Amino acid sequence: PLIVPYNLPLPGGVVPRMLITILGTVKPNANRIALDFQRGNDVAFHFNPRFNENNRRVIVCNTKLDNNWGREERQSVFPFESGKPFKIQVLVEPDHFKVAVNDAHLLQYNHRVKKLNEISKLGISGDIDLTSASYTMI
Amino acid sequence: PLIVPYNLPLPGGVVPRMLITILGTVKPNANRIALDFQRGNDVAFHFNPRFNENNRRVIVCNTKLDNNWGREERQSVFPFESGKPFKIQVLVEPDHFKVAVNDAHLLQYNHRVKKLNEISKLGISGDIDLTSASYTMI
Numbered sequence: 001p002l003i004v005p006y007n008l009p010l011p012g013g014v015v016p017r018m019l020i021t022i023l024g025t026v027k028p029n030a031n032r033i034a035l036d037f038q039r040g041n042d043v044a045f046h047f048n049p050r051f052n053e054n055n056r057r058v059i060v061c062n063t064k065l066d067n068n069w070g071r072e073e074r075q076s077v078f079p080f081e082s083g084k085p086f087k088i089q090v091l092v093e094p095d096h097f098k099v100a101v102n103d104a105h106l107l108q109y110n111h112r113v114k115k116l117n118e119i120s121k122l123g124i125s126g127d128i129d130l131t132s133a134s135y136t137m138i
Numbered sequence: 139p140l141i142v143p144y145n146l147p148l149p150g151g152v153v154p155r156m157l158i159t160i161l162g163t164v165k166p167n168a169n170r171i172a173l174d175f176q177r178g179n180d181v182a183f184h185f186n187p188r189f190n191e192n193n194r195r196v197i198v199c200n201t202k203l204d205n206n207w208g209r210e211e212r213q214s215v216f217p218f219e220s221g222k223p224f225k226i227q228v229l230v231e232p233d234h235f236k237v238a239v240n241d242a243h244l245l246q247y248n249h250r251v252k253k254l255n256e257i258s259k260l261g262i263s264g265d266i267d268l269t270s271a272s273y274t275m276i
């Protein structure tokens with residue numbers, strides 16, 4: 001049972017072939033979840049399941065540069081379920097992040113922050129019980 | 139130079155005579171700051187300087203329980219200055235939090251979440267460069 005928000009420092013920084021695995025359960029009354037790949041106060045990749053953005057479920061992805069969010073990438077395929085276990089995997093490729101939820105490909109996010117090595121940590125926040133957060137190279 | 143949003147776990151939980159000190163600089167075009175004393179999925183005490191709430195500066199304080207905000211406490215005495223250093227100290231008393239900014243008493247916030255020792259962490263977010271965040275007992 002990890003404390004949320006949970007900070008996953010990436011000691012040597014993001015590199016292609018890094019594979020991150022997050023296991024947890026969605027809280028019963030969840031509203032929001034966020035994963036934030038950070039380069040300083042910039043957010044290279046924000047992955048944000050919203051359970052009730054006006055009584056809809058959506059995944060919103062974006063980048064925050066100088067405290068300004070950029071173009072939103074939205075999608076409606078929403079694999080999370082209130083009260084239920086989930087698995088998120090993020091695979092870093094040269095040109096994008098790949099995200100798979102519950103072993104199924106969910107989305108790709110093209111890198112906007114190009115200095116991959118400078119992304120130093122993953123923040124995991126929001127309405128989950130967090131079971132595990134880890135990283136390796138594959 | 140901490141990463142914002144920054145989460146300061148409070149090992150052992152909030153108790154009276156806990157003193158929290160936050161140091162940083164307000165960004166030059168700041169819009170908002172928030173300190174959130176968190177209890178589980180709730181916010182026992184949200185302290186929220188708004189630099190541009192319809193072209194007025196105001197401090198809003200409130201509590202979030204089961205995702206509902208409560209009664210707002212608003213005040214106009216506004217000690218932050220865009221692009222300038224600040225110091226916030228919060229002293230926990232049995233009946234309220236005391237907040238001082240730049241060594242001067244600013245406000246009190248009477249406890250609404252009475253289970254003080256379940257308040258486990260302080261989140262610090264918004265348009266700041268965060269230099270330090272710490273706690274001790276006095």
Ligand SMILES: Cc1nc([C@@H]2O[C@@H](CO)[C@H](O)[C@H](n3cc(-c4cc(F)c(Cl)c(F)c4)nn3)[C@H]2OCC(=O)N2CCN(C(=O)CO[C@@H]3[C@@H](n4cc(-c5cc(F)c(Cl)c(F)c5)nn4)[C@@H](O)[C@@H](CO)O[C@H]3c3nc(C)nn3-c3cc(Cl)ccc3Cl)CC2)n(-c2cc(Cl)ccc2Cl)n1
Nearest residue numbers: 032033034048062069125126170171172186200207263264
């Ligand atoms: C709708 C929207 N959302 C975004 C923006 O978009 C994203 C990327 O494109 C990104 O996902 C954002 N983001 C996600 C997270 C996040 C953080 C987190 F911890 C978890 Cl766990 C998580 F899963 C996700 N962080 N950033 C998304 O930004 C969200 C956003 O800006 N806000 C959330 C919705 N709003 C409120 O709830 C405001 O309500 C206030 C309330 N308060 C203040 C804050 C706050 C948060 C914060 F981080 C900082 Cl730095 C602050 F300084 C403050 N959070 N909640 C309180 O202050 C109460 C006090 O009484 O008042 C609420 C209020 N305000 C008004 C006008 N009314 N009320 C209110 C009061 C009461 Cl009593 C009752 C009811 C109400 Cl409604 C605002 C904050 N964007 C977006 C996208 C883009 Cl591309 C560009 C710009 C924006 Cl804004 N739009």
Ligand SMILES: [Cl-]
Nearest residue numbers: 031032048050
């Ligand atoms: Cl949000």
Ligand SMILES: [Cl-]
Nearest residue numbers: 169170171188
């Ligand atoms: Cl806001």
